[PDB]
Every structure is written in structure tokens, then in C-alpha cells.
């Protein structure tokens, strides 16, 4: 449990072994659990010394200790990672990546992962120094099983961070250089490797449809669905996020998701005990019901409309908001037959009960959905029956009360409905 001053005295000596001991003391000090002294170590000016030690090919232990210490420093605030980067650590770690000693290279992977995880700028800087080539060279083996578990996990997490963050998104050339190894890692059996790969794919699918197309062309959607059916939540969460991001794009990408068999999993996702899983699944359903009428009909065929009715009847308010969005998209883009089927599944009562809330946006969404349903009824000449139904459930009172809402669109919609169909 050395002091900062003792570590400084040791590192400033002209003895390689004394420097090694002081660097190990620094590592152990920065490895503590309760408030490691990162800021005090930075103020002592020890980062350049560790960076210099990184290059002592003749003394592997000092390389390892300085790498560990710099890793733990770069794991903190953006300012501390900036200190590490300003010390010149990126090229030294990239050089260490090719060390004959495996633990040194693993520590280099770890440090570069932290630096890239800082944000977009440091990610692009790590990429510019040329880390992707040696990193992927570490994984260029016939069978990933020959590599050590921790080594592979750290490599996967570092790559996931190299795929992470937006504004700007990762350079396209780097994504193309990384994607094959990411696909090979997405087929590995270790749960942590799988979760990190799914998070990387999630990051890469968040953005314009061209990035989504990059990912989908690699043919990873079936594996993403398979993992969506996984038992480990750490795997299902990123897989569900990736599938949702994929279906936020073109109708053909959403259709590739559907062909993979994703809908079959949603009965359990829309009833999943974890609120976030339910919310993400309902949002995915909302973006699927905004697609083609063929895709709406595929939502119907899989028996997912009753599950949406259920979510609308009882769920977290945010999941209920996503469900109202899904219903309004369904009604806007659906056939008269599909809107009728939706009514027969019992949407009117829950959708009305949700008009007594205090969120103006959902009130507008619901009134728009009801306008669409009334339009379909007019198409079939059943406007009066729908009116009787919205009455018996106690909705008419809700609409006539919304007529007195501060918002203008709520006022207009409530009135319009009352006067057109209820008078």
C-alpha cells in the first residue's frame, strides 16, 4: 500500500528493478475498489513514465504493470482518459498488441477498448493509429476455442466499443473491416462474447438505412433471432434492440426480420417480466405495424393482436404509450377488415380507458385511432354501432371532457368526433 511519493521516488530512480517495483505498487494502488487515486497519480506526472515503460521490450514485467496501470487510469472520467491519450499511449499499446506474451497483449486490448469507449473522437483516433489490423490479427485462428476465454471476451468488448457511439458514427471502412470477425464472434458459444457481439450489432444498426443494410447484407438476422430466443437476458436485450433498429428502416429489412421468424418470439417478449423487454418489443411491434398491409397481416396471423390488446389493458405507462402508437399505425395503414378484426379483439375499452390520462400526445394518438376506426365503420355503415360501443364503455364522457382540454388539437378532435358521430 505505497504512497504516491514513494511510487514517484521509485519510478524516478535509475534502477530498472526499482522502477518495476514502483510501477507494480502504482498498479496495485490504482486497482483498489474504494476511490482509487487516479487524479493524484495524474498530478504526480506518472503517465509519461508508464508510457515509456510500455516500450521496454527487454523487461516484460514492467510493460505489463505500466499497461495495467494505464488501463485502470483510462477507465475513469473523460478527463483521465484524455490524460492517458495525451501521454502518447495509443501507439505504444498498438505496438504491444503483437507482444509474444499473451497477458501484455490482452492488457493492451483492454486499454485500447477503454480509450475507444470514451467517445467518438477517441474511437476514431484509435482507428487512425491502426489498431484494427493487429486486433483482428489476434483473432485470425482456425477455431476461436483455442484462444483463452478472457482474451476473447476482452477482444470482443474492445471491438464492440470500436463499433459504438454516434455523431459521428464509426467510419464505414472500419465497419466493413470489422464485420466479418464480428459475425464469426456472433456464432461463438460463450455468453459474454455473444452479448458483446449483439451490442456491437445493435450500435451498428442504430442510424440510417444504409448502415442497417451493411449489417443485414452479412446475413446475421437469423442468428440475431436465435439469440432473441436465448435464456440469458444479457443476450436477449441487445438482440432485441438490434432487431428493432433493423425494423426501423425499409420494409424489405423489416421483412427479412419477419422471414427470420422473429414474430414467433414476441408472444413471450410482449409478456416478458422485464419492463424494458416489453417496452422494446411493443416499440418494435409499433414499427412493424407501420409497414405494409402484408406485414400487418403477418402480425395478425401470428396472433399478436390480442397481446397488443393485453399490453394496452395492463402494462407500464410507457409500454402502453408504445401500444397506442402501434394501434394508431395499424389503423392508419390497415385494411377495413384488419381494423374490424382489431375492434373485435377488444381494443375500444382499453383505448378509451387510456384517454383519462394526462399525456397530451397519447390522447391525440388515441383520438386519431378512433377517427380511423370511425372512418372504417363509415365504410361499412356501422358508425352507429361503434358509437353505441364507445358510449357503453364510458368513452363519450371522456371525449366530451376532452372538448375542454387546453390543447387545441385535442379540442378539435374531441368536438369533431362528438358532432360527427355522436350527434
Amino acid at each position: 500500500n505505497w504512497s504516491v511519493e514513494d511510487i514517484v521516488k521509485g519510478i524516478n530512480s535509475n534502477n530498472l528493478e526499482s522502477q518495476l517495483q514502483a510501477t507494480q505498487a502504482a498498479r496495485k494502488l490504482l486497482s483498489r475498489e474504494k476511490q482509487p487515486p487516479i487524479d493524484n497519480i495524474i498530478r504526480a506526472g506518472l503517465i509519461p513514465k508508464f508510457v515509456s515503460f510500455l516500450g521496454k521490450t527487454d523487461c516484460s514485467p514492467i510493460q505489463f504493470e505500466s499497461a495495467w496501470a494505464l488501463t485502470n487510469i483510462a477507465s475513469g472520467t473523460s478527463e483521465q482518459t484524455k490524460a492517458v491519450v495525451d501521454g502518447g499511449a495509443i501507439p505504444a499499446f498498438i505496438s504491444l498488441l503483437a507482444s509474444p506474451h499473451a497477458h501484455i497483449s490482452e492488457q493492451a486490448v483492454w486499454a485500447l477498448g477503454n480509450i475507444a469507449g470514451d467517445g467518438s473522437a477517441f474511437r476514431d483516433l484509435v482507428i487512425k493509429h491502426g489498431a484494427i489490423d493487429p486486433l483482428l490479427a489476434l483473432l485470425a485462428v482456425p477455431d476461436l476455442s483455442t484462444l483463452a476465454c478472457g482474451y476473447l471476451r476482452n477482444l470482443t468488448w474492445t471491438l464492440s466499443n470500436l463499433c459504438r457511439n454516434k455523431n459521428p458514427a464509426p467510419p464505414l471502412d472500419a465497419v466493413e473491416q470489422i464485420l466479418p470477425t464480428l459475425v464469426r464472434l456472433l456464432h461463438h458459444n460463450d455468453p459474454e462474447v455473444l452479448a458483446d457481439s449483439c451490442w456491437a450489432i445493435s450500435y451498428l444498426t442504430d442510424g440510417p438505412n444504409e448502415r442497417i443494410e451493411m449489417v443485414v447484407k452479412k446475413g446475421v438476422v437469423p442468428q440475431l433471432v436465435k439469440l432473441l430466443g436465448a435464456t440469458e437476458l444479457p443476450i436477449v436485450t441487445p438482440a432485441l434492440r438490434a432487431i428493432g433498429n433493423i425494423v426501423t428502416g425499409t420494409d424489405e429489412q423489416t421483412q427479412k426480420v419477419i422471414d427470420a421468424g422473429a414474430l414467433a418470439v414476441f408472444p413471450s417478449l410482449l409478456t416478458n417480466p422485464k419492463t424494458n423487454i416489453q417496452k422494446e418489443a411493443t416499440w418494435t411491434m409499433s414499427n412493424i405495424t407501420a409497414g405494409r398491409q402484408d406485414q400487418i397481416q403477418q402480425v395478425v396471423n401470428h396472433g399478436l393482436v390480442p397481446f397488443l390488446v393485453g399490453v394496452l389493458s395492463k402494462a407500464d405507462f410507457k409500454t402502453q404509450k408504445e401500444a397506442a402508437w402501434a394501434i394508431t399505425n395499424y389503423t392508419s395503414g390497415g385494411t377495413v377488415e384488419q381494423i374490424v378484426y382489431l375492434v373485435h379483439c377488444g381494443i375500444i375499452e382499453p383505448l378509451m380507458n387510456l384517454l383519462s390520462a394526462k399525456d397530451t400526445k397519447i390522447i391525440q394518438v388515441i383520438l386519431d385511432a378512433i377517427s380511423n376506426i370511425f372512418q372504417a365503420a363509415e365504410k361499412l355503415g356501422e358508425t352507429e354501432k361503434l358509437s353505441i360501443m364507445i358510449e357503453e364503455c364510458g368513452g363519450l364522457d371522456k371525449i366530451e371532457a376532452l372538448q375542454r382540454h387546453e390543447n387545441e388539437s385535442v379540442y378539435k378532435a374531441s368536438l369533431n368526433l362528438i358532432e360527427k358521430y355522436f350527434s
Binding site: 483492454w110 451490442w199 409499433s286 402508437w325
Partner: peptide, 12 residues
């Protein structure tokens, strides 16, 4: 249509 693993991690 409309629109996590720790970024940084310490050793020990």
C-alpha cells in the same frame, strides 16, 4: 416509423 455494456471497465 419512429426511433448497455459499460463503455469503460477497470481491472481488479
Amino acid at each position: 416509423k419512429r426511433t448497455a455494456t459499460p463503455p469503460k471497465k477497470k481491472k481488479d
